[PDB]
Amino acid sequence: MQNDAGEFVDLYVPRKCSASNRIIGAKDHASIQMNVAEVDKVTGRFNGQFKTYAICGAIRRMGESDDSILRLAKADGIVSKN
Amino acid sequence: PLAKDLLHPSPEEEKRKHKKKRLVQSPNSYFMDVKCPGCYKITTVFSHAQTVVLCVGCSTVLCQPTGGKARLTEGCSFRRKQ
Amino acid sequence: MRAKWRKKRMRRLKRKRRK
Amino acid sequence: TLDEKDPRRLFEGNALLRRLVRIGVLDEGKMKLDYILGLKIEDFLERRLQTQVFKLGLAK
Amino acid sequence: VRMNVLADALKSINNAEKRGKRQVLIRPCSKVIVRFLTVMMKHGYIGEFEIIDDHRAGKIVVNLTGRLNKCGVISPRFDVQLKDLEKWQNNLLPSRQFGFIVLTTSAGIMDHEEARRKHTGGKILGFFF
Amino acid sequence: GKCRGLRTARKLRSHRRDQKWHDKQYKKAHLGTALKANPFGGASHAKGIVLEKVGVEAKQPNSAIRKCVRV
Amino acid sequence: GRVRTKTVKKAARVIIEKYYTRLGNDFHTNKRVCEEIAIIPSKKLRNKIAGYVTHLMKRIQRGPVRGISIKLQEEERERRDNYVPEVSALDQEIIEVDPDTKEMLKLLDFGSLSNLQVTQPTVGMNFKTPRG
Amino acid sequence: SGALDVLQMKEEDVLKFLAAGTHLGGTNLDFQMEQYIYKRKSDGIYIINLKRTWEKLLLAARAIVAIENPADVSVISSRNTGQRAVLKFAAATGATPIAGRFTPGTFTNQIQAAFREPRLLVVTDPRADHQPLTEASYVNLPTIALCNTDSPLRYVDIAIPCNNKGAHSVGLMWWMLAREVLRMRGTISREHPWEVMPDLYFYRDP
Amino acid sequence: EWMPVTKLGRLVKDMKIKSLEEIYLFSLPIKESEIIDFFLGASLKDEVLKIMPVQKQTRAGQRTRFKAFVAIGDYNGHVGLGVKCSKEVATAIRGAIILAKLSIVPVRRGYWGNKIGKPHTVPCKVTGRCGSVLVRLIPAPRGTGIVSAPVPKKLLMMAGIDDCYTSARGCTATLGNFAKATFDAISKTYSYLTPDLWKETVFTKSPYQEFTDHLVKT
RNA sequence: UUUUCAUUAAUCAAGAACGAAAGUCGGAGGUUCGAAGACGAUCAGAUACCGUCGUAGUUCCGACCAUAAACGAUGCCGACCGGCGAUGCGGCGGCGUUAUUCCCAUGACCCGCCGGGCAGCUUCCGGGAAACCAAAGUCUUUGGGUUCCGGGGGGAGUAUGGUUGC
C-alpha cells in the first residue's frame, strides 16, 4: 500500500464483500453490488439517498446471499427488528 | 447457517439436541415421587430405573425395569420433583 | 501367454529340476 | 538479515560501503546498505582503466 | 484417540473461516489454546471469544472476522533458537511484511517479533496469517 | 503415514537407510556386484589385443553393417 | 412423398402476416395474388407457396397458428388480456382458515378479524404417498 | 419496512393475501427458507409468515426503486401461470418483460439482436427458469425471486417467501410488488386505494 | 471505425470511464478488445508463446488445426494470455491476440524487505494450479531478477515484476498448462488478503448506475 | 443410565488365534455332480467347446496345508466441513385407526426427534491426470498419532541359502 516516502503505490484498492469480508476479485463475474433505497420517515418516498451492499461469487453460489442481504438490512435498520 | 448464536441457542432446540452434544451437559432423566394406592408412605424413584423397587409400606411392586424409562404399576401416580 | 499358465509352467520346471 | 543494532552488521556494512565509495560506484548521499542491491554491471565496467583512458580523451 | 488438542482447535477455526461462518465452536479448552487465541486477537485476526465453562473441560465460541487466511499447528513442538528463527519465519510465513509464528518460551506464549524483542528462544506451537 | 515424533530419529534413519536399496542407481553403485561384472572394472579406458574384425547389423528401422573389432 | 422446404414455408408465412386480408380459401385466387405480391423466380415455386398459403388460410379460422402476427386476433387477445370481473375474485363472503394460521395472524395483532372463520383441523395424520 | 407506521401492512392487505391462499406453502422445506416458515401442520403443508413476506416485498420494492431508468429493471416468467402478471407489471412499472421461452445467451451473447444488459432481474419461480438465474452469474446482475417453501436459493439475492402454484397468489404478489414500487416512487398515493384490481394480474386458462 | 455493442463500450467511446482500474474495481465483464486498445494500446506488446499442431482422426486421414498461445502486457502491472485453435496460423494468432487483450488483469506488486521507492516483487508467496502443474511465486530481494524457466519469465516480465523466486511442480513440458498455471498465479495477487487491505471499503457509484443519464441518449 | 474404577489409551518388530475352494494322510459312507480316463459327434486337424458313461474328489469324524480378483483392487484411531428422502436396531415425545371385548397397557400402523450401523440421491465445500470421491476433501496457505509398503519396463517372485511341511 504505502512505502516509507508516504504516497500510495497501487493501481486500485479492491472492494471487500459486505457479508464475508473477502476481496471481490477483478474477474469475479458472479459478484453483485446492490443499491437499496432510503424512504422519507413521514411520507415513505424515495428521498434520493441509498445504501450499497456488495456480495462475492462464493456467497452468491452457496445461496447465503439472501440471509447476508437480510441480516445487513436488519443491522442497517432497513428491515424492522423482529 | 452463517449467523447462529452458538452462545444462546433457543431452549426447544437445546432439549431436542443429544444430551452429550448440548452446549452445557444435562441429563434427560429426573427424580419423581410415587403415591401408591394402598399406602400412605411416600417414596422417591429414578425416571429410568433399573431395579424393581419395592414399597416396604404395603410390600407391592412400584416400577418395572425396561429398555428406557421404568413403567409404573396401574394406580400408583407419579409427580415431578423440582 | 496368460500369467496363471506362466506360473504353472514355472512349477512343472521346478519339479523336474529338484528331481 | 541481521538486526539494525548489531555491532558486526554495523562494522562490516560501513567497511563494505567505504570500499564501494572508495572504488567509485556510489556517492556520500547514497551510502546506505539497501542501495548496494541497486548497482549493476555498467557501474563496475565504467571504472576499468581502459574505459577511463577513453573517457578522459587520452585515446580516441 | 485425540492427541495435541491445539491441532483440532486450529484446524476447526481454519475450516470455519474457509466456509465463511461468523462463529466457530472449539472443544475442549486449555490454557495453551486461550493464550494462542489471545495472541491471534491482540494482532486483530479473530476478535472477541467466550469460554463456555462446564465442570469437565471448557468449550470456546470464537467470533470470526474475514481476515485470517491460514492458522496452522507445528507437531511435534520443535526446539527453536534465535539463530534458527530466520529459517522458520523464512519457511512458514507468506511475506516478511505480515504473519506470525507463536513460540512457547520461559517468558510465555508469544509471537516471533516479541521473541526477538525480549531475546529468548522456545518451542514452536503454530503459525497464523 | 510417516512418524513425526521427537524420538523417531532411529525409525526414520533405519527406514530411509534400507529403502535406498530399492533405488536402481544406489544398489548398482554401493553393492560391489556391478564392478566385478564390468569388463573394465571401474576404469574409464582399457587396453586390449584385437582378435578379429566383425560386421554388426543395425536395429530393425534402418539397415547398415556397423564395422567392429573383437578385442 | 413430398414435404414443403424451409423456402416455401418462410415465404408463405411472411406473405400471410403481411397480406392476411388479401388472401382467402381458394387456391387459384392465392396463386394469382402471389404473382402481384412477390417477385418470385418460377411458376412451380409460386404454385407450391400459393398451395401452402391456401393450407395455412384453412387452419387460421380453426385456431391461432404459432408465430404468425395476423394483427386481427391480437386485438381480441389484448381484449382477453385486458378483462376484469365487476366483483373481485378475492372478495369471498367468509374466508375458511385453519387454526395455526389464526394463531399466526393473532401474533401479528390481527386477532380482531371477524370475516375469518376457523374450521376444525383434520383428525387423521397421513399425507405422504405410499412408497413402494 | 423501516419499522414506520406508514409502511406497516393493513387488514385489507392480509385479507387480500389469505383470499388467494399465499399462506399455503408446499409439502417440502429447503434449509435456507426455514427462517421465513411459521409452523408445520398435519396434511404435510408448511405455512409462510406474512409479516416476513411483507418485509421481503418492501426490501424488493426498495431495491427496484433504487434504479433510475425503469427500462433497466427486467422481469421473467417461464410457466403459463405468471405470464399475464409480468406483461401487466411491465405496463405499469415500465420494466422490460420476457414471457415464455427464455433464449440461452440472452444476457451473455453480445452479437444476438435480442441481446440485453439489464441492471436487475425479478423471477417468477427460480426452479422453473434456472437459465436466466444461471446467466445472471456471468454479468454481475442482482436477482429477486418469489420463492416457495421448497426452492433452490443459488443466485437469489432477495427471496420473497410466498405460494407459487396458486394462479391467484402469483398475480396478487406481482400486483402487490407493482403497487409497492409505484407507491414508493411517488406516482400513486397511500391515502387512495390503487384503481387497478388484482384480477387484472391473474391468469385466464382456456 | 469501431461502433460498440455493450453499454461499457459506448461509455468508453464517450470518454466517460477514465482508467481501466474503474472496470477492475467494479469487476465487470469485458467483451470488446477496443476498450483495452483505448486505454492500453500505446503500451502493449504481444509475444507468441508457441504454435501447437492439434489433430482429429477422420476417415480420410488426420485433420489439422493450429493452437496459438500468445501473451500480451505493458510492463506497468497489466498482463493477459490468449489461446485460439484454427485452420490457419495467422487467423489463430489474430484471434489469440483478441482473447489475450480481453483476458488482461491488473497485477499487484510489493517489496521484499523495507518499503522504499516503487514496488519491484510479488507482495506474498502466491500459487497457481492448472492440470497437474503447480507454479509458486516467492518475493525476491531488489535487483535479483526472475529466477524461473523462459515461459513464466515472459509473463512475469510482461507483468512488470522486476524480481521474483519461482518453484514449479508437475508436467511443465506441457507449455499450455505451465503458461496457464503461472498466469493464474500472477492473477491471484489481488485475491490474496493482506493486513494493509483490512479497512472498511467505501462504496463508489457503479458506472452503469452513475451515467444512466447518457445511456438513455446513446 | 444424576451406577462404578479414574487415564487404565492409540497403533504395532518379535510372538500368537482364525483363515473359502482345491490339495495330502488315516477312518465312515457313496445320492447327485464330476478333474483323470473310455467312447459318440463337430472339424482340414480337436488331444477341446456339444452329448453318453465314469475314477479321485464333492459329504461327515480326527490330523495337516496357510493360499484367492482372500476386492471397497481403498490400513487403523481421532477432529472439522453442505443439504435431501428412505431403511435396520434401541430409546424419547404425540392426534387418530385397528386386535387383546371395554378403561388404561401392550402389539400392528401413522408423524416427528436422538445415537450407532448398510447404503442411496443431489451439490462449483474442496480435491484429482481424469474416471470419479462427501472422501480419494481440510496439500507449496505443504506438520493430529502410528504400522506395513512402491521407486521406468523385462530378467522374476526366477537362482542360490535359510526355515516350515509327509
From Swiss-Prot, chain A:
Pfam family, one: Ribosomal_S21e
Cross-link annotation Glycyl lysine isopeptide (Lys-Gly) (interchain with G-Cter in SUMO2), location: K41
A molecular function (GO) term: RNA binding
Keywords: Acetylation, Cytoplasm, Endoplasmic reticulum, Isopeptide bond, Ribonucleoprotein, Ribosomal protein, Ubl conjugation
GO biological process, one term: endonucleolytic cleavage to generate mature 3'-end of SSU-rRNA from (SSU-rRNA, 5.8S rRNA, LSU-rRNA)
GO cellular component: cytoplasm; cytosol; cytosolic ribosome; cytosolic small ribosomal subunit; endoplasmic reticulum; nucleoplasm; rough endoplasmic reticulum; small ribosomal subunit
Family that this chain belongs to: Belongs to the eukaryotic ribosomal protein eS21 family.
Presence of keyword Nucleus: no
Subunit structure: Component of the 40S small ribosomal subunit.
Coiled-coil stretches noted in the UniProt entry, renumbered to this chain: none
Protein name: Small ribosomal subunit protein eS21
Post-translational modification N-acetylmethionine, affected residues: M1
Function noted in UniProt: Component of the small ribosomal subunit. The ribosome is a large ribonucleoprotein complex responsible for the synthesis of proteins in the cell.
Residues bearing the modification N6-acetyllysine: K81
The species this protein was found in: Homo sapiens
Location relative to the cell: Cytoplasm, Cytosol; Cytoplasm; Rough endoplasmic reticulum
Location, primary (coarse class): cytoplasm
UniProtKB/Swiss-Prot annotation, chain E:
N6-succinyllysine PTM positions: K87
GO CC field: cytoplasm; cytosol; cytosolic ribosome; cytosolic small ribosomal subunit; extracellular exosome; membrane; nucleolus; nucleoplasm
Gene Ontology MF terms in the entry: RNA binding; structural constituent of ribosome
Pfam family, one: Ribosomal_S8
PROSITE patterns: RIBOSOMAL_S8 (PS00053)
Taxonomic placement: Eukaryota, Metazoa, Chordata, Craniata, Vertebrata
Self-association and partners: Component of the 40S ribosomal subunit. Part of the small subunit (SSU) processome, composed of more than 70 proteins and the RNA chaperone small nucleolar RNA (snoRNA) U3.
Function: Component of the small ribosomal subunit. Part of the small subunit (SSU) processome, first precursor of the small eukaryotic ribosomal subunit. During the assembly of the SSU processome in the nucleolus, many ribosome biogenesis factors, an RNA chaperone and ribosomal proteins associate with the nascent pre-rRNA and work in concert to generate RNA folding, modifications, rearrangements and cleavage as well as targeted degradation of pre-ribosomal RNA by the RNA exosome. Required for proper erythropoiesis.
Highest taxon above the source species: Eukaryota
Family membership noted in the UniProt record: Belongs to the universal ribosomal protein uS8 family.
Keyword Cytoplasm in annotation: yes
Location, primary (coarse class): cytoplasm
Keywords: Cytoplasm, Diamond-Blackfan anemia, Nucleus, Ribonucleoprotein, Ribosomal protein
Compartments (UniProt record): Cytoplasm; Nucleus, Nucleolus
Protein name from the UniProt record: Small ribosomal subunit protein uS8
Recorded name of the encoding gene: RPS15A
GO biological process: one example: response to virus
Swiss-Prot record, chain F:
Residues where N6-succinyllysine is found: K53
Cross-link Glycyl lysine isopeptide (Lys-Gly) (interchain with G-Cter in SUMO2) mapped to chain: K36
Localization: Cytoplasm, Cytosol; Cytoplasm; Rough endoplasmic reticulum; Nucleus, Nucleolus
PTM: Hydroxylation at Pro-61 affects translation termination efficiency.
Positions of the UniProt region annotated as Disordered: 1-25
Residues spanning the signal sequence: none
Modification sites for 3-hydroxyproline: P61
Biased segments, Basic residues type: 1-19
Illness association: Brachycephaly, trichomegaly, and developmental delay: An autosomal dominant developmental disorder characterized by brachycephaly, ciliary trichomegaly, dysmorphic features of the face and hands, hearing loss, and developmental delay with short stature. Intellectual disability and autism spectrum disorder may be present in some patients.
Subunit annotation: Component of the 40S small ribosomal subunit. Part of the small subunit (SSU) processome, composed of more than 70 proteins and the RNA chaperone small nucleolar RNA (snoRNA) U3.
Reported function: Component of the ribosome, a large ribonucleoprotein complex responsible for the synthesis of proteins in the cell. The small ribosomal subunit (SSU) binds messenger RNAs (mRNAs) and translates the encoded message by selecting cognate aminoacyl-transfer RNA (tRNA) molecules. The large subunit (LSU) contains the ribosomal catalytic site termed the peptidyl transferase center (PTC), which catalyzes the formation of peptide bonds, thereby polymerizing the amino acids delivered by tRNAs into a polypeptide chain.
Protein's recorded name: Small ribosomal subunit protein uS12
Parent-record interval covered: 2 to 72 of 143
From Swiss-Prot, chain I:
Transmembrane segments: none
Organism per entry: Homo sapiens (Human)
Similarity field: Belongs to the universal ribosomal protein uS5 family.
The S5 DRBM domain, residue ranges: 44-107
GO MF annotation, one: cadherin binding
Record cross-link Glycyl lysine isopeptide (Lys-Gly) (interchain with G-Cter in ubiquitin), residues: K217
GO BP, sorted A to Z: cytoplasmic translation; positive regulation of ubiquitin-protein transferase activity; translation
UniProt name for this protein: Small ribosomal subunit protein uS5
Positions of modified residues (Phosphoserine): S206
First-to-last residue of the parent protein present: 59 to 276 of 293
Post-translational modification, as annotated: Citrullinated by PADI4 in the Arg/Gly-rich region.
Sites bearing Phosphothreonine, chain numbering: T194, T212
Assembly and oligomerization: Component of the small ribosomal subunit. Interacts with zinc finger protein ZNF277 (via zinc-finger domains); the interaction is direct; the interaction is extra-ribosomal. Interaction with ZNF277 competes with the binding of RPS2 to protein arginine methyltransferase PRMT3.
GO cellular component, one term: cytosolic small ribosomal subunit
Described function: Component of the ribosome, a large ribonucleoprotein complex responsible for the synthesis of proteins in the cell. The small ribosomal subunit (SSU) binds messenger RNAs (mRNAs) and translates the encoded message by selecting cognate aminoacyl-transfer RNA (tRNA) molecules. The large subunit (LSU) contains the ribosomal catalytic site termed the peptidyl transferase center (PTC), which catalyzes the formation of peptide bonds, thereby polymerizing the amino acids delivered by tRNAs into a polypeptide chain.
Cross-link (Glycyl lysine isopeptide (Lys-Gly) (interchain with G-Cter in SUMO1)): K217
Modified residues (N6-acetyllysine): K205, K217
